[PDB]
Design a protein around this ligand. Structure first.
Ligand SMILES: OC[C@H]1O[C@H](O[C@H]2[C@H](O)[C@@H](O)[C@@H](O[C@H]3[C@H](O)[C@@H](O)[C@@H](O[C@H]4[C@H](O)[C@@H](O)[C@@H](O[C@H]5[C@H](O)[C@@H](O)[C@@H](O)O[C@@H]5CO)O[C@@H]4CO)O[C@@H]3CO)O[C@@H]2CO)[C@H](O)[C@@H](O)[C@@H]1O
Length: 477
């Protein structure tokens, strides 16, 4: 039987939201995505006989452990936790703006939220509901079955009921990293990591990588070298992986799929057997390649290229469709790949594993449950782990010699460098690295800080600029 080999690689990352001096988490994005996706995505493998693979960044690992140890001083979560009678006006405005940002996401479709937002003034019992419903909107698949009745109530929540939800939420956080260990040991999937603080390795190694796809951009004069710090990102991530899993990582996802001939060399010298990047880089780098093949880079390392179409469909398109339609579309495009090639194709599906689900109905649980059940019965599709895909001899392999540096965002680095605003953050980093006396410089080399800068008016970009400038300052002391 000619088979199609499907590889799912779910990338999970949250930049360090913890302000260095105050030790306060200024955004609750780690807590809400952990209680909703970080435990629940692998928990699918307990109920579906398929293979899924996950990528965890070290900085995400650090935050979840702090939240699981009760040490994270989340300011927003404290506004949820407290009785509304102890709530200052600023915290109440913070709660209402958080609800306004998510008001139109399907996971916030609670009738009570319609009322309370249309309400001009709010009493304590209404504020308790704005807190509790805000927590309950971010409920993952596991606890959605457990707290079904609280979720069915929809209103008239109490302080004790909200605190019960919160303890149940923290139990999931305490169980999160064990499930990644469990699915790795059980063979139900492979776990990978990225360089520690999600940096852009091609830029740190040689900033001239931006001109390979964007020749007339203006980048800041890099008067300092970041090549040593680039190795530290890879090297420290292997130790965090060894801490959690007891072995060194052999598979790594380059942050934002960023690859260069130099990064690939570095990943080879630090022991990475395989990495993955986007189809755009393949089309820029090699003449008429297919993304359905294992690739050897100069015999040193193995590179797989993701399917941009299928991955973006889940990441951006399928949320609008009914669940049955999206799954049928997905299998339809897989059936066309099967007939497009005269070999047994490998189809790599890589995307962020947490951010798309909030825009889906019921946090995407129906779509995922129909996709995993469909994939269970379709026998021309075999889901694989990254390790199984590495050892499989039914996957055609070709050797390539070069790549053109880029990312999965248009094949260029323009989302992080190129304009005056983005270049401001690099000039700050370069000048600070000249004076950097601690490793908080590595936090400031994270990709997220540069992403939010100057693109458009966006949510809580203030908070990102505060942390960047805080990490930079603490890096020079
Ligand atoms: O810009 C218009 C555009 O986006 C709109 O969505 C906005 C959301 O409605 C809003 O919530 C806003 O706020 C958050 C986001 O919700 C939250 O998740 C926050 O946290 C993380 C991600 O969770 C995390 O995964 C990480 O993501 C990385 C990703 O892992 C990596 O693979 C790569 O893709 O880069 C991502 C960023 O580096 O980091 C972010 C933070 O860095 O992110 C936001 C900041 O608070 O998010 C959207 C901003 O507008 C609407 O969808 C629509 O108007 C448009 O499509």
């Amino acid at each position: 039987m000619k088979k199609l080999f499907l590889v799912f690689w779910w990338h999970m990352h949250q930049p360090l939201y913890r302000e260095p001096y105050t030790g306060e988490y200024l955004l609750p994005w780690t807590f809400f995505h952990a209680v909703k996706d970080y435990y629940d995505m692998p928990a699918y493998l307990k109920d579906f006989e398929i293979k899924l693979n996950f990528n965890l960044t070290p900085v995400l690992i650090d935050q979840i452990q702090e939240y699981a140890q009760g040490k994270a001083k989340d300011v927003f979560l404290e506004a949820i936790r407290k009785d509304p009678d102890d709530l200052e006006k600023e915290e109440v405005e913070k709660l209402i703006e958080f609800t306004k940002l998510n008001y139109e996401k399907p996971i916030y479709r609670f009738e009570r939220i319609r009322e309370l937002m249309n309400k001009e003034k709010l009493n304590r019992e209404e504020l308790l509901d704005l807190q509790t419903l805000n927590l309950l909107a971010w409920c993952g698949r596991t606890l959605r079955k457990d707290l079904k009745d609280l979720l069915n109530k929809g209103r008239n929540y109490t302080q004790e009921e909200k605190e019960y939800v919160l303890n149940k939420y923290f139990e999931i956080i305490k169980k999160t990293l064990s499930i990644y260990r469990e699915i790795k040991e059980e063979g139900k999937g492979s776990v990978s990591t990225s360089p520690y603080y999600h940096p852009l390795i091609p830029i740190l190694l040689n900033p001239n990588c931006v001109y390979e796809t964007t020749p007339n951009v203006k980048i800041p004069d890099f008067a300092v070298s970041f090549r040593e710090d680039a190795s530290k990102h890879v090297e420290l991530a292997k130790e965090k992986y060894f801490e959690i899993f007891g072995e060194h990582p052999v598979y790594m996802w380059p942050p934002q799929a960023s690859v260069s001939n130099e990064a690939l060399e570095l990943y080879y010298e630090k022991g990475i057997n395989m990495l993955a990047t986007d189809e755009v880089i393949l089309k820029n780098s090699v003449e008429r390649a297919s993304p359905y093949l294992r690739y050897y880079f100069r015999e040193l390392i193995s590179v797989f290229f993701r399917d941009k179409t299928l991955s973006d469909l889940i990441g951006f398109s399928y949320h609008a469709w009914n669940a049955e339609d999206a799954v049928r579309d997905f299998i339809g495009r897989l059936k066309k790949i099967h007939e497009s090639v005269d070999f047994q194709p490998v189809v790599f599906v890589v995307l962020d594993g947490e951010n798309c689900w909030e825009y889906y109905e019921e946090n995407g649980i129906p779509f995922l449950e129909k996709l995993y059940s469909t994939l269970e019965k379709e026998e021309w599709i075999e889901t694989l782990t990254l390790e199984e895909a590495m050892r499989k001899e039914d996957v055609k392999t070709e050797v390539i010699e070069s790549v053109k540096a880029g990312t999965w965002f248009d094949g260029n680095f323009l989302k992080w460098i190129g304009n005056k605003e983005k270049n401001e953050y690099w000039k700050i980093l370069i000048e600070a690295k000249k004076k950097a006396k601690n490793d908080y410089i590595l936090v400031a080399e994270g990709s997220d800080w540069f992403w939010w800068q100057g693109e458009e008016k966006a949510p809580f970009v203030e908070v990102f600029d505060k942390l960047f400038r805080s990490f930079v300052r603490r890096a020079q002391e």
